[PDB]
Amino acid sequence: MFEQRVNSDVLTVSTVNSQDQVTQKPLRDSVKQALKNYFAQLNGQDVNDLYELVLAEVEQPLLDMVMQYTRGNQTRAALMMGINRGTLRKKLKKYGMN
């Protein structure tokens, strides 16, 4: 009855394929492409903060959307994210979301 939906297919993104046809592709892939392209642009100095660099690109929209979803309610937001309300507050502070 229920068809399997794999973890990679929970968060997806509309793409266009070789037959100009609209289709969903994992968010995983977006991150792949973003980095593939990042690396090309390194001609060719050193990086020492690639994790933080990425993590910020991703924490921001996530907090944004979840706060929109909970209409500003931090308690529910932290709950639905699976983190302490304290860490959420501090994250939001980090990104000036307050």
Added chain:
Amino acid sequence: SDVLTVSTVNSQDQVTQKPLRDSVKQALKNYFAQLNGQDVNDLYELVLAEVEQPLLDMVMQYTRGNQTRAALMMGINRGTLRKKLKKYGMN
């Protein structure tokens, strides 16, 4: 200005970058719409896993398997990196 971007195409077949974060926003918007008021639980772990995997998958690839250079590039402890690779069974 933005270092992490992805390629889009419009109806005029023009390719054009957009920040990764925009993709992330889209994904979540779509996610939330799909679930009609079912409750979400470990959404942070969810997104993190979906992002940490393709990141490790690519730094390793770029450092040709070298954990040490990988960990330095990312800005995290080699120990931490090992832990993450085991967490996603990529080792």
Added chain:
DNA sequence: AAATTTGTTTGAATTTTGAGCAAATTT
């Protein structure tokens, strides 16, 4: 007026980190 959330502290649990070392691998 009740119920819930916020803003904040406190201290314990967990995670990350740096450093050190023989063994293995790469150069």
Added chain:
DNA sequence: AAATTTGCTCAAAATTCAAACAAATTT
């Protein structure tokens, strides 16, 4: 044969957590 990296400890620095609670706010 030298240099680097790995796999593994140890403990200590940092971050995350839960549990308060009054004051504020939302219902």
